[PDB]
Homo-oligomer: 115 residues x 4
Amino acid sequence: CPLMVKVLDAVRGSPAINVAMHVFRKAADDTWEPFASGKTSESGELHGLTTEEEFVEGIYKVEIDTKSYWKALGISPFHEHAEVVFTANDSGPRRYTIAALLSPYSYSTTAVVTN
Amino acid sequence: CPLMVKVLDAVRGSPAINVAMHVFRKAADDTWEPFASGKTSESGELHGLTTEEEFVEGIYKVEIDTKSYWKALGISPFHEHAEVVFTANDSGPRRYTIAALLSPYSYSTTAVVTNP
Amino acid sequence: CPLMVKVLDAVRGSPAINVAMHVFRKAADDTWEPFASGKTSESGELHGLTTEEEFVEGIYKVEIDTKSYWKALGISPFHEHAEVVFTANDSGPRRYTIAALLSPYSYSTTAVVTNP
Amino acid sequence: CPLMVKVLDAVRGSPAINVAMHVFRKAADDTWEPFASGKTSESGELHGLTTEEEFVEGIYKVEIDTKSYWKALGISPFHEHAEVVFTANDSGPRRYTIAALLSPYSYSTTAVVTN
Ligand SMILES: CC(C)=CCc1c(O)cc2oc3cc(O)c(O)c(CC=C(C)C)c3c(=O)c2c1O
Ligand SMILES: CC(C)=CCc1c(O)cc2oc3cc(O)c(O)c(CC=C(C)C)c3c(=O)c2c1O
Ligand SMILES: [Cl-]
Ligand SMILES: [Cl-]
Ligand SMILES: [Cl-]
Ligand SMILES: [Cl-]
């Protein structure tokens, strides 16, 4: 898997578990084509979204349903979702780990791109 | 103003100047309609995007063109843009300051919401 | 002022009001000497800590009492405090804005350094 | 190991490798007693700092030498170091992962506390 997403909860100090997200690829008509989704594990991770053959160069969006997470906890959130939009593989296939750290009125997202 | 955006550069320790952004509002047919746009000033701030009367309840998206900012400084960053999507004014008018803190492979965004 | 600190609350989307902090300056004998202190205002800002003449070159530490802030809101946070340690004015006088963004198990801190 | 530290580099999109840090425990005279140190691995992690028996309740500081890291990269940094100060184990032994995300003029630190 060349794409993994990890989500953490800055209020509880924990992995953010059962967070849903969808991954889209930008089509030629500039619309977002869904192609993968899942929800984070007990470790806050979502693995197995795609394969090296399928994950070709292009622009991808990860839309993380943070609002449902905060709703489940009874805490009023600001954002509808956290969106991470990036071009992949522009220099060849890489492993991408996208990390998101969530608070009700703020989030951070980082990419760690390795070999 | 009821909506202000501030952008900071975490590599240089400075305001992020001349950063373009576009704001959109979700229409009744679920499409993103253009709402306003502008570029940050020398203080990293963009003021005057809207007015209290125009900024009605709805779902708004701010798309901040962080990629062009980094490319002009010679850096090829990870993100295409930083997007902030939120419901505004659901419990009456509020003032929103969106802050974005930028690095080449990371950004943070925060909102400070005040009751006018 | 040459040194300003701004503190924001990422749980409530608000300035972090009445947050205490102490500033220290490293002495010639390598101990931390008291330099200034104060609490944030209703805007989450603490101004007036020092002056251009007093704020000489050196290593400064700002210790922000984030634990008391969260405890007064009913939260038992992870950190005892947020500490910001930095060399100031090494290439002549600068203006420093330190920003801290607080959550119960996380904080971020940023500096914006401007040449007066 | 009840204490692990992970450091990431927000400029390069990578683990922050060979970052030195020291862990201190606050003594009865309010001074900081060193007790563990190390440098991060190729994955940006530092494991094996302490043991469950030794890591008793108390106030601990992790001082991460971020300034040497940025110096090694030729990039002017703001902070002398990143300090993480916390009380441990106040409700019994936990596993603590301290994460730090570094930029030249900013850092973030988070704690994930699990079982
Ligand atoms: C593939 C590799 C060497 C690291 C990818 C990776 C990871 O495997 C675990 C991680 O745990 C983390 C746990 C945290 O509490 C945390 O704050 C981060 C940094 C995420 C931010 C502040 C956007 C990370 C983080 O970036 C991170 C992370 O980037
Ligand atoms: C003097 C100047 C051009 C900017 C200094 C400055 C400021 O005057 C106000 C600010 O408000 C902020 C409000 C926020 O919600 C916010 O998230 C930031 C970013 C700083 C973090 C994530 C620690 C800042 C921020 O860094 C900031 C900031 O750096
Ligand atoms: Cl932010
Ligand atoms: Cl603000
Ligand atoms: Cl962090
Ligand atoms: Cl983790």
